[PDB]
C-alpha cells in the first residue's frame, strides 16, 4: 500500500505532452518519461485533506490490481509539491494506450457500429479484467466505453480505479429509488455494464440515450431488460446480450460463467480479428 507522503516530486522523471481526456476526479494526459521518451498517460488530480483517502485508494488498487494483460499496468504515482495551505497535484502514472478508447473506435467505423466479430473479441477481454479484478474482490463500477481502452497492437485495457453522473450504464440495483433503498455495487453491477457497452458498440450509443440523464435514470429499473433492436445480429450474440443484461441480479450470471457463454468462448479468426483491429488503429 502506498504512501502519499512518500512521493516524489515528477520533475525531471515525466512530463505531460497534451490532454487526451477526463477521468473520475481528474484530467488525463499523454505524458512522457522525460529520460527515455517512452509515452505514458497520466492522471492528473488536485489533492486535498478531503479527497485524500479516495485518491490514495484509487492508486493502491492501480498498484496492486494491474498485473493482468487487459488493466493498463500501473508505472508511478507524484506528488507535485505547492505552497500550503493550498493544493498539491498528484500524478497517477500508467502506460497509454495509443488507439484510444473503445468509444473512439465507434465514432471513426462507418456507421458507428462495429462487426460482431470484433465485439466478441473486445467483450472477452473486458471480462477477462473482470474476472482479474472480482477475484480480487474489486469491483470496477465505471464500466463503459470510454473506460475501454486500445493500445497500438489493439490489445484491450482497463483503466480508471476512481470509482472503484452518468446513468446510462449503470444497474437497476445500483439505482437508489422506492422498491430499492440501500442500492449499492455488487461484482454482477459489472456485467450488466459490459451488456450496455456491447450494444454501444453495436448501435454506436448505449440504450436511453436520447434521453435525459436523469429520466434514464428513472426508467432502467422499470423498463424491460434492453435487447438489440437489429436482428442482423447472430443468436449467440442476442443470447450474450440477455445474459448480460438481467434485472434481477441474483438471477444474473456470474462472472465466470459469462466467460463460458459460447459468445465469448466461440472465437474463431481470434489473431485475425486483431490484425484487423491493429491495422484499423492507422
Ligand atoms: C480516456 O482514457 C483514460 C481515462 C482515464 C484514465 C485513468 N485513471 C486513463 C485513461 C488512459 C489510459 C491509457 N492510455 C490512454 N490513451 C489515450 C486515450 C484517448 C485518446 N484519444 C484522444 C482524442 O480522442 C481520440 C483518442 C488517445 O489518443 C492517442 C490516447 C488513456
Known amino acids: 500500500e502506498i504512501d502519499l507522503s512518500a512521493l516524489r516530486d515528477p520533475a525531471g522523471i515525466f512530463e505531460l505532452v497534451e490532454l487526451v481526456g477526463n477521468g473520475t476526479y481528474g484530467q488525463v494526459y499523454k505524458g512522457r518519461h522525460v529520460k527515455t521518451g517512452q ?3 497520466i492522471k492528473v488530480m488536485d489533492v486535498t485533506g478531503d479527497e485524500e483517502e479516495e485518491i490514495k485508494q484509487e492508486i493502491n488498487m492501480l498498484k496492486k490490481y494491474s498485473h493482468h494483460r487487459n488493466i493498463a499496468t500501473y508505472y508511478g504515482a507524484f506528488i507535485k509539491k505547492n505552497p500550503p495551505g493550498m ?3 498528484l500524478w497517477l502514472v500508467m502506460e497509454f494506450c495509443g488507439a484510444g478508447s473503445v468509444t473512439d473506435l465507434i465514432k471513426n ?9 470484433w465485439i466478441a473479441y473486445i467483450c472477452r477481454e473486458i471480462l477477462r479484467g473482470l474476472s482479474h479484478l472480482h477475484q480480487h474482490k474489486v469491483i470496477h463500477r465505471d464500466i463503459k466505453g470510454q473506460n475501454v481502452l486500445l493500445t497500438e497492437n489493439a490489445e484491450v485495457k482497463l483503466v480508471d480505479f476512481g470509482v472503484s453522473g452518468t446513468p446510462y450504464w449503470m444497474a437497476p440495483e445500483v439505482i437508489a429509488c422506492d422498491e430499492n433503498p440501500d442500492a449499492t455495487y455488487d461484482f454482477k453491477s459489472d456485467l450488466w455494464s459490459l451488456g450496455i457497452t456491447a450494444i454501444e458498440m453495436a448501435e454506436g450509443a448505449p440504450p436511453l440515450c436520447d434521453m435525459h440523464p436523469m429520466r434514464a435514470l428513472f426508467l432502467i429499473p422499470r423498463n424491460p431488460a434492453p435487447r438489440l433492436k437489429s436482428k442482423k445480429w447472430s443468436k449467440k450474440f442476442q443470447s450474450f446480450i440477455e445474459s448480460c443484461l438481467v434485472k434481477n441480479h441474483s438471477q444474473r450470471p456470474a462472472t465466470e460463467q459469462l466467460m463460458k457463454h459460447p459468445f465469448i468462448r466461440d472465437q474463431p479468426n481470434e489473431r ?4 484487423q483491429l491493429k491495422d484499423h488503429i492507422d
Open 272 to 275: 485475425q480479428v486483431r490484425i
Open 109 to 117: 467505423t462507418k456507421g458507428n457500429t462495429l462487426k460482431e466479430e
Open 87 to 89: 493544493d498539491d497535484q
Open 39 to 41: 509515452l505514458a498517460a
